Amino acid sequence: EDPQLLVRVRGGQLRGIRLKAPGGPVSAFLGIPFAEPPVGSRRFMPPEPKRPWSGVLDATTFQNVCYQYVDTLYPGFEGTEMWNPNRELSEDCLYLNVWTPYPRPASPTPVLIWIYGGGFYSGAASLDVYDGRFLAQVEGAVLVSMNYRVGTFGFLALPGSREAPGNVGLLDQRLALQWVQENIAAFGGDPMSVTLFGESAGAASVGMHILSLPSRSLFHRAVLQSGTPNGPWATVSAGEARRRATLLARLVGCPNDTELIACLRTRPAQDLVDHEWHVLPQESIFRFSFVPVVDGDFLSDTPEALINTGDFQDLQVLVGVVKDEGSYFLVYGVPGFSKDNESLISRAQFLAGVRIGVPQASDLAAEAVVLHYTDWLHPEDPTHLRDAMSAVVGDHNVVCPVAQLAGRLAAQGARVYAYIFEHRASTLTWPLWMGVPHGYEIEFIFGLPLDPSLNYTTEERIFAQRLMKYWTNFARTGDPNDPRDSKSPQWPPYTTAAQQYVSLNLKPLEVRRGLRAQTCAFWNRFLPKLLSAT
Amino acid sequence: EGREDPQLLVRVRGGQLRGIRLKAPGGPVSAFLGIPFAEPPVGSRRFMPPEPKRPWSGVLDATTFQNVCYQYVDTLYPGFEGTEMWNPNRELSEDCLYLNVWTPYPRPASPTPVLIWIYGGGFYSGAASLDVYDGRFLAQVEGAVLVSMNYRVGTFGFLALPGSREAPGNVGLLDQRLALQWVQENIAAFGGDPMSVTLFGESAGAASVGMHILSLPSRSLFHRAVLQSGTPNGPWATVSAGEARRRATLLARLVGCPNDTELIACLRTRPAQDLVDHEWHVLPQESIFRFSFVPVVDGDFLSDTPEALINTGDFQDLQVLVGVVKDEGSYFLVYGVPGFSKDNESLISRAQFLAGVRIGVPQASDLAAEAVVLHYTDWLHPEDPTHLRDAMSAVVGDHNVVCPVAQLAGRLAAQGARVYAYIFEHRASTLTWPLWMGVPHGYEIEFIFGLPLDPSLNYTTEERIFAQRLMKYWTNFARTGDPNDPRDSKSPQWPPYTTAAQQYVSLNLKPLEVRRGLRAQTCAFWNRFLPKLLSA
Ligand SMILES: *[C@@H]1O[C@H](CO)[C@@H](O[C@@H]2O[C@H](CO)[C@@H](O)[C@H](O)[C@H]2NC(C)=O)[C@H](O)[C@H]1NC(C)=O
Ligand SMILES: C[N+](C)(C)CCOC(=O)CCC(=O)OCC[N+](C)(C)C
Ligand SMILES: C[N+](C)(C)CCOC(=O)CCC(=O)OCC[N+](C)(C)C
Ligand SMILES: *[C@@H]1O[C@H](CO)[C@@H](O)[C@H](O)[C@H]1NC(C)=O
Ligand SMILES: *[C@@H]1O[C@H](CO)[C@@H](O)[C@H](O)[C@H]1NC(C)=O
């Protein structure tokens, strides 16, 4: 019995496992329950706190993945399978993981809490890319990650109902946050220095915690990677959540809300997942059936309204995007695209793809997108059209929403730092045309290139080490720069005047100005004016 | 005759003429100035198509420029060469339908290509007699025969009660056409080749050239065309029958004139100046680069709209040269946009930019105007008064000239025409407008006509060489339909504009540089997006 691996938390005693990191050991406590299992009558309901337990709970292994859809577009392919569940699926999935230095930190250490992405329909904290050991060992950080409910289980809502109120996956995350405030000191973590970080739907999640008052006493800083609470996909209205929940119910033979929710609770988990992708209003990509709802509770108003009227004075945010945010999504619905060819498309296929990639756009608004993204010197060139399609989807769904948030936060007191991530992993199994796809910065921030068995280059290991420092410097101080340092390319704050951000690549930091400024003016200022007049 | 220079006596269809021996820097030229080509369009003839000039007895003196057609005279900046250089240099009269001819001295032995200049000035102003249109240098240096005609402007050329007999519209264009007919019948008397006539003009003059391309009866009267900083398509060069009628009727009321015959009859009783004094009061909006009396789509001279005609036309037999100056819009901003002045830097605010766009794009809805502001904003510096000033210039220039030209060039190329496109980017060293205005509308003309060759004018040596290059491109085009010299292979070549490659050349002090896409993205905005917005 190694006393470093034995911790007492409020609910009882835990035994962790000593893991090997490249430069030394780390203590890991995996599969710690933070809620009562949300099963049977507790499906669709807010999480309840975990009852205390007897003896010593075994926290040496990852727990089950929340019940979710599993991707089958390309069986066996690493590019898709690296995001699929790696533990058994279950509705009993509300557990969290903690990595700490070995021996445990002498003095209180900054805490980073990772919230995974996956469209609010998928994801798990057990995926290898989310491995906290490298950050623990190298940076001395305490790293925490939680499972939260996804799909119908986390986000099906009959708004105003007592028994399916909506947003329960966000309340799962909040309970884990509450757990960290109460327990993280036992691991050497500093509960007065918690940084949320996440990617895609996890970044949207982080933003929702910034915009929900109860969450704000549970952290101090935030990192939003490739995702925002504002934007086209991260929220639905109460009417539209009700519509989808009602249509899903109908699809599974169910059945007054009480009666409808009750019948849904009798259905096997897979029966719900079976009909998950039949409730969307259009043929679309980058669109997810069950997501956070503007309920007037967790979210007091729309994220747009909230970001425009918020006071962000004692907040620090790190935000950014990858170079090719849209590319990944094109192979999942747009005719002409595939990982297995160069996806050189016709102009006809481009016009069609815009209707799928901007599914809420009217005929005129779709036409304005096509005209803006056409290179009128090469209007029919298949490479330009393919790359333009990627751009439309990435800009609409991620870059322009990020730019808009960055600017509101900055304008309203927040200290903001922005980046574009431009390095394509040498190990990537997706084709060259997709570039630096959505999700492929995470492995560098988590420090996976430091594991020499993973076949990254020496430059990537050095690069990962740089990114780990920025993120953990930010966690420590709300500033990604070194306090004592190498020095003379400093990462400057993003402001609404200068609009400075940095390129994250194998070369030293480069400061640029304007995150797609002209194009995001199109999406953020023109298109809203268009369809609100028309 | 007897004691008189035998090289200056020529007979045309109407009778005998006496010209004048003028000095060009390189040697003498012959000029026959003030040749009547129509009956004076005065009295009962006002607003009516021109009648060909009846023959005269004796020898008509063709030694001086004749009267300028009655017109508005610019008052904005009195005594200032920037404005005065375009103002009338002879007395104003409705008796003004004269044309001018310049030829080598002695007149060429074998038939020479003819260039016909059609001046600009909004269809409300202009004269063939301005110094800037002086044909002596082209005649002397290139051996060209150059013709320039006066045509009626303002109400006198373009006021229309469409469908009427007494005021059918387009009569100023009919004046231009009669001159083209005159050249056909008569230019051989001067050594010009009637089977090789190339038109050219700037602004309204270029719109006019394009209307002759688009009008059947004019097509037999010339062989190649050159349109500088203007087009028949676009927002300002024509008006619908209904808008022409509305403007004519409003003007009539304003001068105290109530049946079209009765209305037009009463208009003919009014002093020419009364008409001029009210012509600016009939535009539908507060605007710039908009002109009250302009060609009308009558279903006669213009059988449909220029847009329809350029889209459905067969131009296989057409060789055309078209282009633009670097700063088409700057000039116009000082005649209407609050914030702008020739006497300061015109650093405007964002509020002044939005205001100006309403004036610069007068026919735009609120949504269209905001699309323009959003497109032209530098979102890295949205409040910077230097960019705002220059975006205001660009809006006006792109909407009214650059994108219509891009448009025309593409339709013509797509439909068989051999097209050559340029952008002119040299700012004359003698320009009196402020630097912020760049290379403004009309300031290439003096180089094409060769004024820098006159040492009394104080241009640089480099500017003289550059003028000689341009005169060669223009006359080579006139001669052959190709502005390149066949023997000179060392100089860089000017390639034709095509839809595939969209090539065009920069005209400046440096050798020709080929560029691709004449403002392709922005003109997609004006030519493809806004039209689709309009339908909704
Ligand atoms: C440059 O000169 C112009 C011409 O007078 C000035 O324009 C005026 O600006 C004021 C203040 O904004 C307005 O009230 C007027 O409407 C403008 N006059 C007109 C009719 O153009 C301009 O202010 C000058 N620039 C500076 C700062 O010296
Ligand atoms: C982003 N990530 C790297 C974390 C995981 C990749 O997941 C996707 O398949 C992206 C495409 C997608 O969202 O598909 C959902 C639609 N569906 C369910 C029909 C596949
Ligand atoms: C022939 N040129 C274009 C080289 C010079 C034209 O000069 C102008 O007046 C341009 C400004 C203008 O069109 O004035 C219109 C307003 N108005 C009529 C009141 C003077
Ligand atoms: C690329 O691959 C996809 C999938 O089979 C196919 O539908 C598409 O037409 C292909 N394109 C070309 C032109 O090879
Ligand atoms: C040109 O320069 C001369 C020589 O200094 C000067 O005296 C003359 O007035 C100038 N004329 C013009 C046209 O500017």
Side-chain angles (χ1 to χ4, degrees), chain A residues 1-483 485-534, chain B residues 1-489 491-536:
Chain A
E1 190 87 282
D2 184 345
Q4 290 290 315
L5 305 175
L6 194 54
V7 189
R8 175 148 261 160
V9 296
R10 282 186 191 183
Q13 276 186 315
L14 304 162
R15 187 186 305 98
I17 179 178
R18 184 172 149 287
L19 296 179
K20 184 75 175 62
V26 303
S27 312
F29 303 84
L30 308 180
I32 300 172
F34 68 86
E36 289 295 278
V39 297
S41 82
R42 305 184 193 123
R43 187 192 273 176
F44 316 126
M45 305 208 70
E48 310 164 56
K50 177 60 179 85
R51 294 175 305 124
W53 58 84
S54 69
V56 174
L57 189 58
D58 181 61
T60 62
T61 193
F62 280 126
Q63 267 285 356
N64 293 163
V65 166
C66 290
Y67 208 92
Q68 68 189 242
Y69 169 91
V70 179
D71 204 83
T72 50
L73 184 66
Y74 294 124
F77 174 58
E78 182 69 33
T80 52
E81 300 291 2
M82 69 165 270
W83 309 108
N84 273 341
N86 63 341
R87 291 301 177 289
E88 288 290 329
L89 289 177
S90 182
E91 289 189 71
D92 182 355
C93 67
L94 292 193
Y95 304 85
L96 56 82
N97 315 303
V98 179
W99 296 260
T100 209
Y102 186 104
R104 71 173 54 126
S107 55
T109 308
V111 181
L112 279 163
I113 309 184
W114 176 250
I115 311 180
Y116 56 77
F120 298 107
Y121 74 87
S122 63
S126 51
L127 303 185
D128 295 333
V129 279
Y130 309 144
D131 188 343
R133 76 217 281 154
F134 307 98
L135 282 166
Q137 206 282 323
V138 172
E139 300 298 336
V142 168
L143 202 41
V144 184
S145 73
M146 87 293 292
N147 286 354
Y148 62 91
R149 283 176 280 172
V150 296
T152 53
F153 310 96
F155 295 101
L156 179 142
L158 287 151
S161 74
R162 299 183 55 183
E163 42 277 306
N167 299 322
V168 306
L170 292 165
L171 293 173
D172 295 345
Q173 301 168 12
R174 180 180 282 172
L175 191 59
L177 268 45
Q178 268 153 16
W179 189 98
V180 166
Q181 287 298 294
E182 292 167 356
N183 295 297
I184 209 60
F187 303 81
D190 190 350
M192 298 188 290
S193 178
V194 172
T195 301
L196 309 179
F197 73 139
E199 188 271 349
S200 191
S205 293
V206 173
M208 280 161 208
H209 293 291
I210 294 171
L211 300 175
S212 198
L213 214 69
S215 289
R216 295 296 308 272
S217 59
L218 309 186
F219 66 102
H220 315 77
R221 285 174 278 286
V223 176
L224 290 85
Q225 302 173 211
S226 301
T228 50
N230 52 303
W233 57 269
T235 65
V236 288
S237 67
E240 176 68 5
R242 174 165 289 282
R243 191 214 125 232
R244 295 179 192 188
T246 302
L247 170 54
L248 181 90
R250 183 182 167 265
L251 288 174
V252 295
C254 288
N256 182 15
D257 289 346
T258 297
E259 204 179 61
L260 180 149
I261 296 154
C263 174
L264 279 174
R265 285 197 307 250
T266 68
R267 288 289 178 289
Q270 190 54 42
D271 286 25
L272 268 33
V273 170
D274 272 3
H275 291 288
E276 209 194 310
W277 298 109
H278 296 326
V279 292
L280 282 173
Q282 253 86 218
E283 179 184 9
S284 54
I285 57 182
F286 217 129
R287 218 107 304 179
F288 318 112
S289 302
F290 296 95
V291 303
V293 55
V294 181
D295 55 353
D297 179 14
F298 192 104
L299 298 180
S300 55
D301 205 339
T302 69
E304 175 169 66
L306 293 178
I307 74 180
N308 294 352
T309 60
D311 183 12
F312 298 116
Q313 49 220 153
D314 286 25
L315 186 72
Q316 297 98 49
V317 196
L318 182 63
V319 308
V321 299
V322 295
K323 192 165 167 268
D324 297 274
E325 291 289 354
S327 60
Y328 200 110
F329 295 88
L330 296 179
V331 297
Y332 282 99
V334 185
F337 292 86
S338 176
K339 80 170 195 67
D340 295 317
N341 65 23
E342 302 223 273
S343 304
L344 298 174
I345 55 161
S346 79
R347 182 162 188 78
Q349 284 173 324
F350 176 58
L351 308 206
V354 166
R355 310 310 307 264
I356 295 172
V358 189
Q360 275 73 71
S362 61
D363 297 353
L364 184 55
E367 186 65 2
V369 173
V370 169
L371 298 177
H372 184 96
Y373 278 89
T374 298
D375 190 318
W376 294 100
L377 260 173
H378 311 95
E380 310 223 75
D381 176 59
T383 296
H384 277 89
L385 297 160
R386 172 250 273 155
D387 287 342
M389 192 65 249
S390 174
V392 164
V393 169
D395 288 345
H396 174 53
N397 293 300
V398 186
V399 184
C400 291
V402 166
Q404 186 174 55
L405 182 68
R408 296 313 295 206
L409 295 167
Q412 288 157 215
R415 174 178 212 67
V416 183
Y417 291 89
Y419 69 84
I420 177 157
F421 181 90
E422 295 188 321
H423 174 64
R424 184 184 156 96
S426 61
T427 54
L428 212 30
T429 55
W430 293 106
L432 292 157
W433 73 256
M434 296 194 168
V436 189
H438 188 80
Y440 288 89
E441 85 282 24
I442 299 167
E443 55 203 85
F444 293 94
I445 303 302
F446 273 91
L448 273 70
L450 284 63
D451 185 348
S453 84
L454 293 180
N455 300 321
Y456 291 91
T457 72
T458 310
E459 293 72 26
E460 288 170 323
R461 200 204 67 239
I462 294 156
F463 177 51
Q465 285 179 334
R466 276 176 53 219
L467 295 193
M468 290 171 76
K469 262 270 178 304
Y470 292 143
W471 263 239
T472 56
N473 279 343
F474 179 74
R476 267 185 286 279
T477 68
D479 188 340
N481 301 282
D482 273 57
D485 52 8
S486 323
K487 282 179 169 60
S488 189
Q490 291 283 296
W491 187 338
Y494 183 93
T495 57
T496 62
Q499 301 169 54
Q500 289 166 304
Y501 64 104
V502 301
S503 60
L504 292 182
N505 58 48
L506 294 186
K507 311 190 279 176
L509 278 193
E510 173 173 285
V511 182
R512 303 179 184 166
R513 292 169 65 165
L515 213 40
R516 240 98 146 182
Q518 288 312 107
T519 290
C520 290
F522 168 79
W523 287 104
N524 297 337
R525 305 189 192 241
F526 177 66
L527 279 191
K529 284 185 197 212
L530 176 48
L531 297 192
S532 86
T534 337
Chain B
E1 43 185 277
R3 291 299 186 188
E4 194 182 342
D5 184 347
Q7 193 63 41
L8 298 171
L9 304 173
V10 171
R11 177 179 282 272
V12 294
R13 178 67 182 76
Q16 279 180 311
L17 299 174
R18 175 177 42 249
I20 190 166
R21 189 184 142 151
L22 297 174
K23 303 184 176 211
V29 305
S30 305
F32 298 84
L33 305 173
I35 305 172
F37 68 90
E39 286 300 316
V42 308
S44 64
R45 302 265 221 272
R46 190 193 274 179
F47 313 124
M48 302 215 67
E51 271 178 307
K53 177 64 173 180
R54 292 197 298 264
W56 56 87
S57 58
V59 174
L60 187 138
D61 183 280
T63 68
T64 62
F65 289 117
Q66 196 37 268
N67 300 305
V68 181
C69 296
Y70 219 107
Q71 58 195 256
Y72 179 87
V73 172
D74 197 291
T75 37
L76 188 57
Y77 297 114
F80 164 71
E81 171 77 3
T83 58
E84 305 283 19
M85 75 156 267
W86 311 100
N87 280 343
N89 58 351
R90 295 275 171 285
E91 280 153 289
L92 300 176
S93 152
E94 293 188 78
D95 183 0
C96 73
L97 294 188
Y98 298 91
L99 62 69
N100 313 295
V101 184
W102 285 268
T103 78
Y105 183 102
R107 295 189 303 272
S110 83
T112 309
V114 176
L115 283 177
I116 307 179
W117 177 247
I118 309 189
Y119 61 82
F123 292 106
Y124 76 91
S125 68
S129 59
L130 308 188
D131 290 356
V132 51
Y133 312 142
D134 181 345
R136 78 179 64 192
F137 307 97
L138 286 160
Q140 206 283 327
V141 178
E142 302 299 334
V145 178
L146 197 134
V147 186
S148 71
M149 88 296 280
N150 278 4
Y151 62 90
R152 284 173 283 177
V153 294
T155 48
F156 311 102
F158 296 102
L159 178 153
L161 287 145
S164 67
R165 178 173 38 194
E166 306 91 348
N170 296 327
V171 303
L173 286 170
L174 280 179
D175 298 344
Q176 293 168 13
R177 176 183 285 173
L178 195 58
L180 309 196
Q181 294 178 334
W182 183 96
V183 162
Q184 281 303 292
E185 168 90 359
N186 295 300
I187 209 64
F190 300 88
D193 185 354
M195 303 189 69
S196 170
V197 178
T198 291
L199 314 190
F200 70 129
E202 182 272 6
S203 194
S208 294
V209 169
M211 288 168 197
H212 284 117
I213 300 176
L214 295 172
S215 196
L216 256 168
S218 299
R219 285 306 294 276
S220 36
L221 310 173
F222 71 105
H223 310 77
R224 281 176 274 275
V226 169
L227 299 82
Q228 312 172 196
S229 297
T231 55
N233 59 297
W236 57 267
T238 66
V239 287
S240 56
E243 181 63 7
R245 175 165 287 276
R246 189 217 129 231
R247 287 175 192 190
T249 304
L250 178 48
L251 179 104
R253 272 188 292 264
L254 290 179
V255 296
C257 283
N259 192 299
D260 283 345
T261 303
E262 161 165 310
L263 183 153
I264 300 154
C266 177
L267 280 175
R268 291 193 310 257
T269 64
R270 308 314 313 157
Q273 193 63 52
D274 277 21
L275 295 181
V276 173
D277 289 355
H278 297 92
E279 98 172 80
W280 296 103
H281 298 323
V282 308
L283 287 167
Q285 316 294 337
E286 178 181 359
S287 61
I288 61 172
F289 217 134
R290 291 287 183 278
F291 312 110
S292 293
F293 297 95
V294 295
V296 57
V297 179
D298 51 355
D300 185 12
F301 195 106
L302 295 171
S303 73
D304 204 339
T305 65
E307 172 182 313
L309 292 175
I310 77 162
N311 294 351
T312 58
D314 172 342
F315 305 108
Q316 291 185 205
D317 50 60
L318 187 70
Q319 292 147 163
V320 200
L321 179 45
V322 309
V324 303
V325 302
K326 190 164 173 285
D327 306 85
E328 291 283 356
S330 58
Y331 199 117
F332 296 88
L333 301 180
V334 304
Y335 287 94
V337 186
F340 291 87
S341 178
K342 89 183 189 57
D343 294 320
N344 68 35
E345 298 311 306
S346 293
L347 295 195
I348 55 155
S349 72
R350 181 156 189 85
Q352 284 170 329
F353 178 60
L354 309 189
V357 170
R358 293 334 287 281
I359 298 163
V361 195
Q363 277 74 71
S365 54
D366 290 3
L367 182 59
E370 193 55 46
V372 165
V373 165
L374 289 181
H375 186 85
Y376 275 89
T377 301
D378 183 347
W379 293 99
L380 259 173
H381 304 105
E383 316 260 67
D384 186 76
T386 295
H387 178 267
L388 289 168
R389 181 193 71 195
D390 297 337
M392 189 62 254
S393 176
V395 162
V396 168
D398 291 348
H399 171 53
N400 290 295
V401 183
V402 182
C403 295
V405 168
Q407 157 155 275
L408 185 61
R411 297 312 296 201
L412 295 173
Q415 282 139 35
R418 170 148 296 201
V419 191
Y420 288 96
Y422 63 87
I423 183 164
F424 178 88
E425 308 182 308
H426 175 67
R427 159 182 260 251
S429 64
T430 56
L431 211 19
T432 45
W433 295 103
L435 292 163
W436 73 255
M437 293 197 200
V439 184
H441 191 69
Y443 285 90
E444 84 287 22
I445 296 168
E446 63 204 57
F447 291 90
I448 310 269
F449 273 87
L451 272 63
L453 281 49
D454 184 358
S456 78
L457 295 185
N458 298 336
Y459 293 85
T460 67
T461 295
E462 300 78 271
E463 282 178 324
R464 200 250 304 154
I465 302 315
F466 174 59
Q468 288 177 308
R469 271 174 65 210
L470 297 182
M471 300 163 81
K472 277 206 153 15
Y473 291 142
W474 259 243
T475 55
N476 289 336
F477 177 75
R479 269 190 275 284
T480 67
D482 177 346
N484 298 287
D485 191 39
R487 51 187 154 163
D488 178 35
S489 64
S491 290
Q493 294 281 306
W494 188 338
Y497 183 92
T498 57
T499 67
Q502 302 181 55
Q503 293 168 297
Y504 69 102
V505 293
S506 49
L507 299 180
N508 49 47
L509 297 190
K510 316 167 71 163
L512 281 189
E513 163 179 297
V514 177
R515 290 175 192 172
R516 286 188 57 199
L518 179 51
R519 204 152 306 184
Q521 291 306 121
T522 291
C523 289
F525 172 76
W526 293 102
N527 298 339
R528 291 159 187 284
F529 179 62
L530 293 182
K532 283 208 152 205
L533 182 54
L534 194 54
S535 329

